[PDB]
């Protein structure tokens, strides 16, 4: 049995195994807070997330289970996964805290594009990695739905992982079907976000920096043009349909005149991502085959996910049932090998 120690971090007590040393706060995460740490077992740097009040209500309890199940399933180099999961609890009766461990990623995408004019080759690599991770999570019928630079973790060598998938926020990267609440959408909501992110990496400017939902919609329509009646099919609110229908008709812009000086292959990819019709939007797997990524693309190294059983999502269980199921998942966790890759 590991010896734990207590340390106050972010004005609360963390209780962690001696294995993890030199904890230092590196910001909030989804439903928790995160500390960097040194794993004395492997000499690796890790990030430890302590969930906040994981069993306070059935909402917290189910999202705790959801997140632990999801992270236990994710095994991809561009997707956050688990090195460890622990609790100071000695039994289910004591079980009230959950800590999740992953490799340390020092930055997010906003740290990369802020004070640096990125080269096109570097933008290619960053977007390629997002799409590789999206192909994987999408293959398991998991969608991010709120992909944005602050949800892309990046290390010192621009290696990137998607986080907080499948779970006041900026809406500047959200797919229009999400932001304004369409009755049905698909996995390519995330591809819209990639388009917005890529545009910003190329120009240094946020593509659609709207001040409210209506201002953001008008910015979007100025670029991609007014939608046809067909897309009104997806909007339930009559007042919203009436408003959009009421707008003066706008032509789609030629993206080549918007992204002056960009790689023409980048402009072509943006044209395929930033389309209002989500059934016309390029998929992650299709985008990986686009010539923009030719120097990185490798079909042998763009894997899909094992099937993921989400049948628990339709079920209402009691707090103590979610808590016991979560405890089961903590105890059954099998840490991965330190080295899980081989030369191609
Ligand atoms: N520094 C770093 N490195 C890796 C991940 C995170 C992380 C996690 C997280 C998720 C699961 C897990 F098991 C452990 C940590 N959640 C939010 N963040 C963010 C903390 C600051 N914003 C960017 C990343 N932070
Ligand atoms: N001000 C910005 N950074 N973006 C707003 C934009 C700029 C141009 C491309 C699209 C459409 C239209 C012209 C309005 C987005
Ligand atoms: Ca390769
Ligand atoms: Ca190896
Ligand atoms: Ca490596
Ligand atoms: Ca090969
Ligand atoms: Cl599974």
Swiss-Prot record:
SMART domains: S_TKc. Dual phosphorylation can also be mediated by TAB1-mediated autophosphorylation. TCR engagement in T-cells also leads to Tyr-308 phosphorylation by ZAP70. Dephosphorylated and inactivated by DUPS1, DUSP10 and DUSP16. PPM1D also mediates dephosphorylation and inactivation of MAPK14. This is Mitogen-activated protein kinase 14. Its cofactor is Mg(2+). The keyword Oxidoreductase does not apply. GO terms for biological process: angiogenesis; apoptotic process; bone development; cartilage condensation; cell morphogenesis; cell surface receptor protein serine/threonine kinase signaling pathway; cellular response to ionizing radiation; cellular response to lipopolysaccharide. It comes from the Eukaryota. Its EC number is 2.7.11.24. The lineage of its organism: Eukaryota, Metazoa, Chordata, Craniata, Vertebrata. Residues 20-293 form the Protein kinase domain. The TXY motif contains the threonine and tyrosine residues whose phosphorylation activates the MAP kinases. The modification N6-acetyllysine is found at residues 49, 148. Pfam families: Pkinase (PF00069).
